[PDB]
Amino acid sequence: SEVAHRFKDLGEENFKALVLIAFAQYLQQCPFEDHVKLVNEVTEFAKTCVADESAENCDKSLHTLFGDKLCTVATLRETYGEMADCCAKQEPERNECFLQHKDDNPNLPRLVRPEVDVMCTAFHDNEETFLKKYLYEIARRHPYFYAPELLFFAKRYKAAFTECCQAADKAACLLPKLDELRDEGKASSAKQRLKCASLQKFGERAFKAWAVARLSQRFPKAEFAEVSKLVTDLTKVHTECCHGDLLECADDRADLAKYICENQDSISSKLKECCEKPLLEKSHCIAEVENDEMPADLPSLAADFVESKDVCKNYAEAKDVFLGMFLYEYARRHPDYSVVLLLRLAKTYETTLEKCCAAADPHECYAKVFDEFKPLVEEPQNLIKQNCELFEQLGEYKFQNALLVRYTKKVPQVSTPTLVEVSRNLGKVGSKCCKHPEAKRMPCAEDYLSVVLNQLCVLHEKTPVSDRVTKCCTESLVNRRPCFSALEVDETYVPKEFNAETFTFHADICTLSEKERQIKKQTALVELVKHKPKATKEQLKAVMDDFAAFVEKCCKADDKETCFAEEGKKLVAAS
């Protein structure tokens, strides 16, 4: 029934892929072979169902059906914090349990890829199995990956092997395509992780506000009713994907692309090329199409939202409709603002109507709202202008180091591995955004930062250690980035005790690749700051410069290990 409805709509090939992804994300520790085994059973059952929709057992729910297949290879768990057995429950409690057990940082080994020759031989040997392993390793390491987009990655992944495994220089053709795909997947997963956190932690109203603002910037010409309809459909898609309901998410997404391509005249002029592509491409394209041109002569927003005398009445009739219209009007006129800034303005506006419409003369009370926005607009502009200046004189690696010192001082209780990863990711904002013109810099920079800080929040939620992180993460979704910025030095922190091993040698620091050696030095920097949180910019400078010179010296020495040991104590001594 419902299983037949989705098979028919999606076709067997996408169906099988989506079921495999769902299984791997619910049971992240189960081996490849078992999942393949269960997906195949479910698929052939599905076929019996479209043959006779009232046959056997075709009328069960998708939750029930996949729940049962899963529970035949459960295990009664052990490592999930403080958990109960889901497979011992009844729906929808069973499904609820599954979802809350999704692990954002599973203890799985980093995947190192074999020689180009091995991969190609494996691909030509068993193509079906090679491609399913790709889906399975990604899906279990990224439990919130956007399902229909993973299908698009895997289609491109297949395309690279098919073409390059038959070239003169295979490695030279394949690696640049794999490396680019891996980078794309990482950013993709981080954006989606922020969408699910919004729906799950802050609620449906939070997500819908984000979408009203975003789509208004992109489709400035569309009426408000057309915008709202799109927001409503897009919100259903992400609610199903974020809830683990992947088949319907995929199906509903396909439906929205086609509604949109059927109504370009009422939405945007930038949609033609996107709307001629194959299924999976078309949606990927439409999701990232450029902002259309804003309608010519838009009136000032003052008459309707601040000057009029009916403001309080129109608002009180339906507060969220009135605030939604306000966000739509402001956003479509400001493609040069980040979406977090637009939401901050709309919230400032709400706060002022709540206070003023209860005062004795509201008109007088709210007459100057728009004046409150100017400080809020300027803050993000100055920050970015300055950070890009710094980035441009430091270059990426050293910009990263500057941010690492800053954050380790703000929140010194956060683990070192977590701090290094987050600081590195924040520093990539320079490379990604500073190249753009000024009227294009804030959306790029400020919304990217929001994605990276969400990562910090979801990691920290799993094992809390800092009440300052907890506060900035939960007080306000939209004010997260201003909240961390205002933090300085954690005055209550007791400096970490000196540890000699932590600041010792290796001799094999030589022969390490670039990436690895910078990682190694950045870890040492984090620990040095934990040891001496009030050491200045000038003191830290001298010590790093001394370190860099110490390493250069000992890698070309005749007796390297002796140099590392003995020139090491001298470095330690100088302080």
Coordinates of all heavy atoms in Angstrom, one line a residue, residues 134-210:
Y134 N 29.9 2.9 -0.8 CA 30.0 4.3 -0.8 C 28.9 4.9 0.0 O 29.1 5.7 1.0 CB 30.1 4.9 -2.2 CG 30.0 6.4 -2.3 CD1 31.2 7.1 -2.1 CD2 28.9 7.1 -2.6 CE1 31.2 8.5 -2.1 CE2 28.8 8.5 -2.6 CZ 30.0 9.2 -2.4 OH 29.9 10.6 -2.5
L135 N 27.6 4.6 -0.3 CA 26.4 5.1 0.4 C 26.5 4.7 1.9 O 26.2 5.6 2.7 CB 25.2 4.5 -0.2 CG 24.7 5.0 -1.6 CD1 23.5 4.3 -2.1 CD2 24.5 6.5 -1.6
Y136 N 26.9 3.5 2.2 CA 26.9 3.0 3.6 C 27.9 3.6 4.5 O 27.5 3.9 5.7 CB 27.0 1.4 3.5 CG 27.5 0.8 4.8 CD1 26.5 0.5 5.8 CD2 28.8 0.4 5.0 CE1 27.0 -0.2 7.0 CE2 29.2 -0.2 6.2 CZ 28.3 -0.5 7.2 OH 28.7 -1.2 8.3
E137 N 29.1 3.8 4.1 CA 30.1 4.5 4.9 C 29.8 5.9 5.2 O 30.1 6.4 6.2 CB 31.5 4.3 4.3 CG 31.9 2.8 4.0 CD 32.2 2.0 5.3 OE1 32.0 2.5 6.4 OE2 32.6 0.8 5.2
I138 N 29.2 6.6 4.2 CA 28.9 8.0 4.4 C 27.7 8.2 5.3 O 27.7 9.0 6.3 CB 28.5 8.7 3.0 CG1 29.5 8.5 1.9 CG2 28.2 10.1 3.3 CD1 30.6 9.5 2.0
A139 N 26.7 7.4 5.0 CA 25.4 7.5 5.7 C 25.6 7.2 7.2 O 25.0 7.9 8.1 CB 24.4 6.6 5.1
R140 N 26.4 6.2 7.6 CA 26.6 5.9 9.0 C 27.4 6.9 9.8 O 27.4 6.9 11.0 CB 27.1 4.5 9.2 CG 28.6 4.3 9.1 CD 28.8 2.9 8.5 NE 30.2 2.4 8.7 CZ 30.5 1.5 9.6 NH1 29.5 1.0 10.4 NH2 31.7 1.1 9.8
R141 N 28.3 7.6 9.1 CA 29.2 8.6 9.7 C 28.5 9.9 9.8 O 28.9 10.8 10.6 CB 30.5 8.7 9.0 CG 31.4 7.5 9.2 CD 32.8 7.7 8.6 NE 33.7 6.6 8.9 CZ 33.6 5.4 8.4 NH1 32.7 5.1 7.6 NH2 34.5 4.5 8.8
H142 N 27.4 10.1 9.0 CA 26.7 11.4 8.9 C 25.2 11.1 9.0 O 24.5 11.2 7.9 CB 27.0 12.2 7.7 CG 28.5 12.5 7.6 ND1 29.4 11.6 7.1 CD2 29.2 13.6 7.9 CE1 30.6 12.2 7.1 NE2 30.5 13.4 7.6
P143 N 24.6 10.9 10.2 CA 23.3 10.3 10.4 C 22.2 11.3 9.9 O 21.1 10.9 9.6 CB 23.2 10.1 11.9 CG 24.5 10.3 12.4 CD 25.3 11.2 11.5
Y144 N 22.6 12.6 9.8 CA 21.6 13.6 9.2 C 21.9 14.1 7.8 O 21.2 15.0 7.3 CB 21.6 14.8 10.2 CG 21.2 14.4 11.6 CD1 22.1 14.0 12.5 CD2 19.9 14.5 12.0 CE1 21.7 13.7 13.8 CE2 19.5 14.2 13.3 CZ 20.4 13.7 14.2 OH 20.0 13.4 15.5
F145 N 22.8 13.4 7.0 CA 23.0 13.8 5.6 C 21.7 13.9 4.9 O 20.8 13.1 5.1 CB 23.9 12.7 4.9 CG 24.8 13.3 3.8 CD1 26.1 13.6 4.0 CD2 24.2 13.4 2.5 CE1 26.9 14.1 3.0 CE2 25.0 13.9 1.5 CZ 26.3 14.3 1.7
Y146 N 21.6 14.9 4.0 CA 20.3 15.1 3.2 C 20.2 14.0 2.2 O 20.9 13.9 1.2 CB 20.4 16.5 2.6 CG 19.1 17.1 2.0 CD1 17.9 16.6 2.4 CD2 19.1 18.1 1.1 CE1 16.7 17.1 1.9 CE2 18.0 18.6 0.5 CZ 16.7 18.2 0.9 OH 15.6 18.7 0.4
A147 N 19.2 13.1 2.5 CA 19.0 11.9 1.7 C 19.0 12.0 0.1 O 19.8 11.3 -0.5 CB 17.8 11.1 2.2
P148 N 18.2 12.8 -0.4 CA 18.1 12.9 -1.9 C 19.4 13.5 -2.5 O 19.6 13.2 -3.7 CB 16.9 13.8 -2.2 CG 16.1 13.8 -0.9 CD 17.2 13.7 0.2
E149 N 20.1 14.2 -1.7 CA 21.4 14.8 -2.2 C 22.5 13.8 -2.2 O 23.4 13.8 -3.1 CB 21.8 16.0 -1.4 CG 21.2 17.4 -1.9 CD 21.8 17.8 -3.2 OE1 23.0 18.0 -3.2 OE2 21.1 18.0 -4.2
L150 N 22.5 12.9 -1.2 CA 23.4 11.7 -1.3 C 23.3 10.9 -2.6 O 24.3 10.4 -3.1 CB 23.3 10.9 0.0 CG 24.3 9.8 0.3 CD1 25.7 10.3 0.0 CD2 24.2 9.2 1.7
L151 N 22.0 10.8 -3.0 CA 21.8 10.1 -4.3 C 22.5 10.8 -5.5 O 23.1 10.1 -6.3 CB 20.3 10.0 -4.7 CG 19.4 9.2 -3.7 CD1 18.1 8.8 -4.4 CD2 20.1 8.1 -3.1
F152 N 22.5 12.1 -5.4 CA 23.2 12.9 -6.4 C 24.7 12.8 -6.4 O 25.4 12.7 -7.4 CB 22.7 14.3 -6.3 CG 23.3 15.3 -7.4 CD1 23.0 15.1 -8.7 CD2 24.2 16.3 -7.0 CE1 23.5 16.0 -9.7 CE2 24.7 17.1 -8.0 CZ 24.4 17.0 -9.3
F153 N 25.3 12.8 -5.2 CA 26.7 12.6 -5.0 C 27.1 11.2 -5.5 O 28.1 11.1 -6.3 CB 27.1 12.7 -3.5 CG 27.2 14.1 -3.0 CD1 26.1 14.7 -2.4 CD2 28.3 14.8 -3.2 CE1 26.2 16.0 -1.9 CE2 28.4 16.1 -2.7 CZ 27.4 16.7 -2.1
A154 N 26.4 10.2 -5.2 CA 26.7 8.8 -5.6 C 26.6 8.7 -7.1 O 27.3 7.9 -7.7 CB 25.9 7.8 -4.8
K155 N 25.7 9.4 -7.7 CA 25.6 9.4 -9.2 C 26.8 10.0 -9.8 O 27.3 9.5 -10.8 CB 24.3 10.0 -9.7 CG 24.3 10.2 -11.2 CD 23.0 10.6 -11.7 CE 23.1 10.8 -13.3 NZ 21.8 10.4 -14.0
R156 N 27.3 11.1 -9.2 CA 28.5 11.7 -9.7 C 29.8 10.9 -9.4 O 30.7 10.8 -10.2 CB 28.7 13.1 -9.1 CG 28.0 14.2 -9.9 CD 28.2 15.6 -9.4 NE 27.8 15.8 -8.0 CZ 28.0 16.8 -7.3 NH1 28.6 17.9 -7.8 NH2 27.6 16.9 -6.0
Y157 N 29.8 10.2 -8.3 CA 30.9 9.4 -7.9 C 31.1 8.2 -8.9 O 32.2 8.0 -9.4 CB 30.6 8.8 -6.5 CG 31.7 7.9 -5.8 CD1 32.7 8.5 -5.2 CD2 31.5 6.6 -5.8 CE1 33.7 7.8 -4.6 CE2 32.5 5.8 -5.2 CZ 33.6 6.4 -4.6 OH 34.5 5.6 -4.0
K158 N 30.0 7.6 -9.2 CA 30.0 6.5 -10.3 C 30.5 7.1 -11.6 O 31.2 6.3 -12.3 CB 28.6 6.0 -10.5 CG 28.4 5.1 -11.7 CD 27.1 4.4 -11.7 CE 26.9 3.5 -12.9 NZ 25.7 2.7 -12.9
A159 N 30.2 8.3 -11.9 CA 30.5 8.9 -13.2 C 32.0 9.1 -13.3 O 32.6 9.0 -14.4 CB 29.8 10.2 -13.4
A160 N 32.7 9.5 -12.2 CA 34.1 9.7 -12.2 C 34.9 8.4 -12.4 O 35.9 8.3 -13.1 CB 34.6 10.3 -10.9
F161 N 34.5 7.3 -11.8 CA 35.1 6.0 -11.9 C 35.0 5.5 -13.3 O 35.9 5.0 -13.9 CB 34.6 5.0 -10.9 CG 35.3 5.0 -9.6 CD1 34.9 6.0 -8.6 CD2 36.4 4.2 -9.3 CE1 35.6 6.0 -7.4 CE2 37.0 4.2 -8.1 CZ 36.6 5.2 -7.1
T162 N 33.7 5.6 -13.8 CA 33.4 5.1 -15.2 C 34.3 5.7 -16.2 O 34.8 5.1 -17.2 CB 32.0 5.3 -15.5 OG1 31.1 4.5 -14.7 CG2 31.7 5.0 -17.0
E163 N 34.6 7.0 -16.1 CA 35.4 7.8 -17.0 C 36.9 7.6 -16.9 O 37.6 7.5 -17.8 CB 35.0 9.2 -17.0 CG 35.9 10.1 -17.9 CD 35.6 11.6 -17.7 OE1 34.6 12.0 -17.0 OE2 36.5 12.4 -18.1
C164 N 37.4 7.7 -15.6 CA 38.8 7.8 -15.3 C 39.5 6.4 -15.3 O 40.7 6.4 -15.6 CB 39.0 8.6 -14.1 SG 38.3 10.2 -14.2
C165 N 38.8 5.4 -14.9 CA 39.3 4.1 -14.9 C 39.7 3.5 -16.3 O 40.2 2.4 -16.4 CB 38.4 3.1 -14.2 SG 38.2 3.4 -12.4
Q166 N 39.5 4.4 -17.3 CA 39.9 4.1 -18.7 C 40.6 5.2 -19.3 O 40.4 5.5 -20.5 CB 38.6 3.7 -19.5 CG 37.3 4.4 -19.1 CD 36.1 3.6 -19.4 OE1 35.8 2.6 -18.8 NE2 35.3 4.1 -20.4
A167 N 41.5 5.8 -18.6 CA 42.4 6.9 -19.1 C 43.8 6.6 -19.0 O 44.2 5.7 -18.2 CB 42.0 8.2 -18.3
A168 N 44.7 7.3 -19.7 CA 46.1 7.1 -19.7 C 46.7 7.2 -18.3 O 47.3 6.3 -17.8 CB 46.8 8.2 -20.6
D169 N 46.4 8.4 -17.7 CA 46.8 8.6 -16.3 C 45.5 8.6 -15.4 O 44.8 9.5 -15.4 CB 47.5 9.9 -16.1 CG 48.2 10.0 -14.7 OD1 47.8 9.3 -13.8 OD2 49.2 10.8 -14.6
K170 N 45.2 7.4 -14.8 CA 43.9 7.3 -14.1 C 43.9 8.2 -12.8 O 43.0 9.0 -12.6 CB 43.7 5.8 -13.7 CG 43.8 4.9 -14.9 CD 43.3 3.5 -14.5 CE 44.2 2.8 -13.5 NZ 43.8 1.4 -13.2
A171 N 45.0 8.1 -12.0 CA 45.1 8.8 -10.8 C 45.0 10.3 -11.0 O 44.5 11.1 -10.1 CB 46.3 8.5 -10.0
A172 N 45.4 10.8 -12.1 CA 45.4 12.2 -12.5 C 44.1 12.7 -12.9 O 43.7 13.9 -12.8 CB 46.5 12.5 -13.5
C173 N 43.2 11.8 -13.4 CA 41.9 12.1 -13.8 C 40.9 11.9 -12.6 O 39.9 12.6 -12.5 CB 41.5 11.2 -15.0 SG 39.7 11.0 -15.4
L174 N 41.1 10.9 -11.8 CA 40.2 10.5 -10.7 C 40.3 11.3 -9.5 O 39.3 11.9 -9.0 CB 40.4 9.0 -10.4 CG 39.3 8.3 -9.5 CD1 37.9 8.6 -10.0 CD2 39.7 6.8 -9.4
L175 N 41.5 11.5 -8.9 CA 41.7 12.2 -7.6 C 41.2 13.6 -7.6 O 40.7 14.0 -6.5 CB 43.2 12.1 -7.2 CG 43.8 10.7 -7.1 CD1 45.3 10.8 -6.8 CD2 43.0 9.9 -6.1
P176 N 41.2 14.4 -8.6 CA 40.7 15.8 -8.5 C 39.2 15.8 -8.5 O 38.6 16.8 -8.0 CB 41.2 16.4 -9.8 CG 42.3 15.6 -10.3 CD 42.0 14.2 -9.9
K177 N 38.6 14.7 -9.0 CA 37.1 14.6 -8.9 C 36.6 14.1 -7.6 O 35.5 14.4 -7.2 CB 36.6 13.8 -10.1 CG 37.3 14.1 -11.4 CD 36.5 13.5 -12.6 CE 37.2 13.9 -13.9 NZ 36.3 14.0 -15.0
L178 N 37.4 13.2 -7.0 CA 37.0 12.6 -5.7 C 37.3 13.6 -4.6 O 36.4 13.8 -3.7 CB 37.9 11.4 -5.4 CG 37.7 10.1 -6.3 CD1 38.3 8.9 -5.6 CD2 36.2 9.9 -6.6
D179 N 38.4 14.4 -4.7 CA 38.7 15.4 -3.7 C 37.7 16.5 -3.7 O 37.3 17.0 -2.6 CB 40.1 15.9 -4.0 CG 41.2 15.0 -3.4 OD1 40.9 14.2 -2.5 OD2 42.4 15.1 -3.9
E180 N 37.2 16.9 -4.9 CA 36.2 17.9 -5.0 C 34.8 17.5 -4.4 O 34.1 18.2 -3.8 CB 36.1 18.4 -6.4 CG 35.0 19.4 -6.7 CD 34.6 19.4 -8.2 OE1 35.1 18.6 -8.9 OE2 33.9 20.3 -8.6
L181 N 34.5 16.2 -4.7 CA 33.3 15.6 -4.2 C 33.3 15.5 -2.7 O 32.3 15.8 -2.0 CB 33.1 14.2 -4.8 CG 32.3 14.1 -6.1 CD1 32.2 12.7 -6.5 CD2 30.9 14.7 -5.9
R182 N 34.4 15.1 -2.1 CA 34.5 15.0 -0.6 C 34.3 16.4 0.1 O 33.7 16.4 1.1 CB 35.9 14.4 -0.2 CG 36.1 14.4 1.3 CD 37.6 14.4 1.6 NE 37.8 14.3 3.1 CZ 38.3 15.3 3.8 NH1 38.6 16.4 3.3 NH2 38.4 15.1 5.1
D183 N 34.9 17.4 -0.5 CA 34.8 18.8 0.0 C 33.3 19.2 -0.1 O 32.8 20.0 0.8 CB 35.7 19.7 -0.8 CG 37.1 19.5 -0.4 OD1 37.5 18.7 0.4 OD2 38.0 20.2 -1.1
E184 N 32.6 18.9 -1.1 CA 31.3 19.3 -1.4 C 30.3 18.6 -0.4 O 29.4 19.2 0.2 CB 30.9 18.9 -2.8 CG 29.8 19.8 -3.4 CD 29.6 19.6 -4.9 OE1 30.7 19.5 -5.6 OE2 28.5 19.6 -5.4
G185 N 30.6 17.3 -0.1 CA 29.8 16.5 0.8 C 29.9 17.0 2.2 O 28.9 17.0 3.0
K186 N 31.1 17.4 2.6 CA 31.3 17.9 4.0 C 30.5 19.2 4.2 O 29.9 19.3 5.3 CB 32.8 18.2 4.2 CG 33.6 16.9 4.6 CD 35.1 17.2 4.8 CE 35.4 17.9 6.1 NZ 36.8 18.0 6.4
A187 N 30.5 20.1 3.3 CA 29.8 21.4 3.5 C 28.2 21.1 3.4 O 27.5 21.6 4.2 CB 30.2 22.4 2.4
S188 N 27.8 20.2 2.5 CA 26.5 19.7 2.4 C 25.9 19.2 3.7 O 24.8 19.5 4.1 CB 26.4 18.6 1.3 OG 25.1 18.1 1.2
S189 N 26.7 18.3 4.4 CA 26.2 17.7 5.6 C 26.1 18.7 6.7 O 25.2 18.7 7.5 CB 27.2 16.6 6.0 OG 27.0 16.1 7.3
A190 N 27.1 19.7 6.8 CA 27.0 20.7 7.8 C 25.8 21.7 7.7 O 25.2 22.0 8.7 CB 28.3 21.6 7.9
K191 N 25.5 22.1 6.5 CA 24.2 22.9 6.3 C 23.0 22.1 6.7 O 22.1 22.6 7.4 CB 24.1 23.2 4.8 CG 25.1 24.2 4.3 CD 24.8 24.6 2.8 CE 23.8 25.8 2.8 NZ 23.8 26.5 1.4
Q192 N 22.9 20.8 6.4 CA 21.7 20.0 6.7 C 21.6 19.8 8.2 O 20.5 19.8 8.8 CB 21.6 18.7 6.0 CG 20.4 17.8 6.2 CD 19.1 18.5 5.7 OE1 19.2 19.4 4.9 NE2 18.0 17.9 6.0
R193 N 22.7 19.6 8.9 CA 22.8 19.5 10.4 C 22.2 20.7 11.1 O 21.6 20.5 12.2 CB 24.2 19.2 10.9 CG 24.2 18.7 12.4 CD 23.5 17.3 12.5 NE 23.4 16.9 13.9 CZ 22.4 17.2 14.7 NH1 21.4 18.1 14.3 NH2 22.3 16.7 15.9
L194 N 22.4 21.9 10.5 CA 21.8 23.1 11.1 C 20.2 23.1 10.8 O 19.5 23.6 11.7 CB 22.4 24.3 10.5 CG 21.8 25.7 10.9 CD1 21.8 25.9 12.4 CD2 22.4 26.8 10.1
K195 N 19.8 22.6 9.7 CA 18.3 22.5 9.4 C 17.6 21.6 10.4 O 16.5 21.9 10.9 CB 18.1 22.1 8.0 CG 18.4 23.1 6.9 CD 18.0 22.7 5.5 CE 18.2 23.8 4.5 NZ 19.7 24.1 4.4
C196 N 18.2 20.4 10.7 CA 17.6 19.5 11.6 C 17.6 20.0 13.1 O 16.6 19.9 13.8 CB 18.2 18.1 11.5 SG 18.0 17.2 9.8
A197 N 18.7 20.6 13.5 CA 18.8 21.2 14.8 C 17.7 22.3 15.0 O 17.0 22.3 16.1 CB 20.2 21.8 15.1
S198 N 17.5 23.1 14.0 CA 16.4 24.1 14.0 C 15.0 23.5 14.3 O 14.3 23.9 15.2 CB 16.4 24.9 12.7 OG 17.6 25.6 12.5
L199 N 14.7 22.5 13.5 CA 13.4 21.9 13.6 C 13.3 21.2 14.9 O 12.3 21.3 15.6 CB 13.2 20.8 12.4 CG 12.9 21.5 11.1 CD1 13.2 20.5 9.9 CD2 11.4 22.0 11.0
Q200 N 14.3 20.5 15.3 CA 14.3 19.6 16.5 C 14.5 20.4 17.9 O 13.9 20.0 18.9 CB 15.3 18.5 16.4 CG 15.0 17.5 15.3 CD 16.1 16.4 15.1 OE1 17.3 16.7 15.3 NE2 15.7 15.2 14.8
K201 N 15.3 21.4 17.9 CA 15.6 22.1 19.2 C 14.8 23.4 19.4 O 14.4 23.7 20.5 CB 17.1 22.5 19.2 CG 18.0 21.3 19.7 CD 17.8 21.1 21.2 CE 18.5 19.9 21.6 NZ 18.7 19.9 23.1
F202 N 14.6 24.1 18.3 CA 14.0 25.4 18.3 C 12.5 25.5 17.8 O 11.8 26.4 18.0 CB 14.9 26.5 17.7 CG 16.2 26.7 18.4 CD1 17.3 25.9 18.1 CD2 16.3 27.6 19.5 CE1 18.5 26.0 18.8 CE2 17.5 27.7 20.2 CZ 18.6 26.9 19.8
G203 N 12.1 24.4 17.1 CA 10.8 24.3 16.6 C 10.4 24.7 15.2 O 11.2 25.3 14.6
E204 N 9.3 24.2 14.7 CA 8.8 24.5 13.4 C 8.8 26.0 13.0 O 9.1 26.4 11.9 CB 7.4 23.9 13.1 CG 7.0 24.0 11.7 CD 5.6 23.4 11.4 OE1 4.6 24.0 11.8 OE2 5.5 22.2 10.8
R205 N 8.3 26.8 13.9 CA 8.3 28.3 13.7 C 9.7 28.9 13.4 O 9.8 29.7 12.6 CB 7.6 29.0 14.9 CG 7.4 30.5 14.8 CD 6.8 31.0 16.1 NE 6.4 32.4 16.1 CZ 7.2 33.4 16.6 NH1 8.4 33.1 17.2 NH2 6.8 34.7 16.5
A206 N 10.7 28.4 14.1 CA 12.1 28.8 13.8 C 12.5 28.5 12.4 O 12.9 29.4 11.6 CB 13.1 28.2 14.8
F207 N 12.3 27.3 11.9 CA 12.6 26.9 10.5 C 11.9 27.7 9.5 O 12.5 28.1 8.5 CB 12.4 25.4 10.3 CG 12.8 24.9 8.9 CD1 14.2 24.6 8.7 CD2 11.9 24.9 7.9 CE1 14.6 24.2 7.4 CE2 12.3 24.6 6.6 CZ 13.7 24.2 6.3
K208 N 10.6 27.9 9.7 CA 9.8 28.6 8.7 C 10.1 30.1 8.6 O 10.0 30.6 7.5 CB 8.3 28.5 9.1 CG 7.7 27.1 9.0 CD 6.3 27.1 9.4 CE 5.4 27.7 8.3 NZ 3.9 27.5 8.6
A209 N 10.6 30.7 9.7 CA 11.1 32.1 9.6 C 12.4 32.1 8.8 O 12.5 33.0 7.9 CB 11.5 32.5 11.1
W210 N 13.3 31.2 9.0 CA 14.5 31.1 8.2 C 14.1 31.0 6.7 O 14.7 31.6 5.8 CB 15.4 29.9 8.6 CG 16.6 29.7 7.7 CD1 17.8 30.2 7.7 CD2 16.6 28.8 6.5 NE1 18.6 29.8 6.7 CE2 17.9 28.9 5.9 CE3 15.6 28.0 5.9 CZ2 18.2 28.2 4.8 CZ3 16.0 27.3 4.7 CH2 17.3 27.4 4.2

